[PDB]
Design a protein around this ligand. Structure first.
Ligand SMILES: [Ca+2]
Ligand SMILES: [Ca+2]
Ligand SMILES: [Ca+2]
Ligand SMILES: [Ca+2]
Ligand SMILES: [Mn+2]
Lengths: 291, 305
């Protein structure tokens, strides 16, 4: 019935052959929603048996392009088939300017055959709650960015985590975040935690291979910034344990996993902190939103 | 035989049109010459498909857009923005028909705010979203001399604007000829029957052509819009027939051009069953005597005589 589908499970903008870019489908009361829209979200929702014309709203955690790369495809292709249902894009500050740019990308091609037909944009800031018919949503600023609280950057540039309160189910999606007290509170006693994860040193070691002249200082600072802005396996389990969630689903995993040994390593590392049902998601996995 | 790079066309996404299919990703192609990666049309999921084909976003040197319909460009925003996010070091050139400049500029506008916010670290250096991209507008008859091939672009019959008119100048759909050192490959892009395309394809080693079952395509459009008026679907049928290639027009094209082999991509609706493959390949074969292949996603075709 109601379902979460992990459409793309890769973390970060370095694409992977068997882990598609950040993309999720939320299916509630027969209605289709998208949560983050990396490249290929249209292809992936179709593989999951869903329809592009059925998308009623998109929810954007933050403006990194591994999370928005596929939004221009979703909007323009809906336009091209004259989709008839209204679509609303939710996102942090700057999502309005971002979507407006999509209309500018569309403009000339659409004129050849308006681009903003049947598209509404809502900007969310920290603590906003929005009541829709199928669920209640809460957005909170997390620790993915390091702007000093109170600065203009801290207001202008936010990364959000999402709580979706269904009639009889609560699921928390971290988006990209480091360890965060806000996220810990938001996820209190949730039925399902859908969380990011990273192997920091493996991510760094791949980048050093692809940049063989990277100085020692530059990869060291990459390492610390990644550890500040993403969740390690231990931190996932600690967040799951502290918030007392009922089940944990890992997506946005970097690097991409391919072998049972790897799955065992990371699942057991989470299990040092959290004793529950733990799933490392694959593309097109479906999770029943039912108590 | 496994050692050393080969020159290849990879049909990354083989679907025709903007109605997505579970097993045919959106129009996308890779042209891989002298170990350099080029993209020819860039529907949604182009980044995902080139990665599946063993290529990397950071190796893409140029993109060639045949026309500005969104089943052919909807993935280009992802290709440019994902390359910017990893600080790709090489210059990327986007070629396309008139309007490709305004379209790429909109991509940079879509990128602006995420690019400014970047990774959220105080002291980060600003870098423009348009870093290391240039855009070349092509028009009918142009030839571009690159080191790895000579490109010719010609206006085809995908659009029916009257010659001379404002729209005929503004809106063009292109077919491409790529002349490599020892091989010629012609890419129809989207087109109806077209003498210009037939002439461009003359004696080509390989023709990469679109194809369409018009009445089945119409049926899918009707199911998508169940209140479409009867005259509208009748005019849609007439429009698709003159602006796309039926299986018989594909065979006539390949035969009148005398191409050495034909490869069908951009096929609408998507095919799933061997009876379908037998039907359509035989309808092409009724006119064309050479080698025929109906491509699948990630199929690779060697650019060697
Ligand atoms: Ca991310
Ligand atoms: Ca991010
Ligand atoms: Ca097309
Ligand atoms: Ca077209
Ligand atoms: Mn990331």
């Amino acid at each position: 019935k109601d379902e979460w589908i992990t459409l793309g499970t890769m973390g970060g903008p370095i694409p992977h052959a068997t882990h598609s870019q950040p993309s999720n489908a939320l299916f509630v009361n027969g209605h289709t929603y998208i949560v983050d829209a990396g490249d290929g979200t249209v292809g992936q929702l179709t593989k999951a048996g869903l329809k592009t014309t059925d998308v009623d709203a998109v929810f954007i955690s933050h403006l990194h392009f591994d999370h928005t790369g596929g939004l221009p495809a979703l909007l323009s292709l809906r336009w091209q088939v004259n989709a008839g249902n209204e679509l609303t894009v939710y996102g942090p500050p700057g999502i309005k300017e971002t979507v407006d740019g999509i209309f500018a990308f569309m403009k000339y091609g659409a004129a050849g055959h308006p681009a903003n037909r049947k598209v509404n944009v809502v900007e969310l800031t920290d603590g906003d709650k929005v009541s829709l018919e199928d669920f209640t949503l809460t957005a909170v600023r997390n620790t993915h960015f390091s702007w000093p609280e109170g600065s203009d950057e801290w207001k202008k540039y936010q990364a959000l985590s999402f709580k979706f309160e269904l009639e009889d189910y609560t699921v928390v999606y971290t988006g990209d975040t480091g360890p965060s007290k806000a996220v810990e509170l938001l996820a209190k006693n949730a039925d399902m935690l859908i969380s990011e994860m990273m192997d920091v040193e493996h991510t760094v070691n791949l980048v050093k291979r692809a940049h063989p002249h990277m100085p020692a200082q530059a990869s060291k600072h990459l390492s610390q910034h990644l550890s500040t802005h993403h969740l390690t396996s231990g931190e996932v389990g600690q967040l799951a344990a502290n918030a007392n969630v009922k089940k944990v689903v890992i997506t946005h995993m970097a690097p991409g996993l391919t072998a049972p040994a790897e799955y065992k390593k990371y699942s057991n590392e989470i299990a040092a902190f959290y004793q529950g049902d733990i799933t490392l998601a694959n593309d097109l996995d479906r999770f029943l939103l039912q108590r």
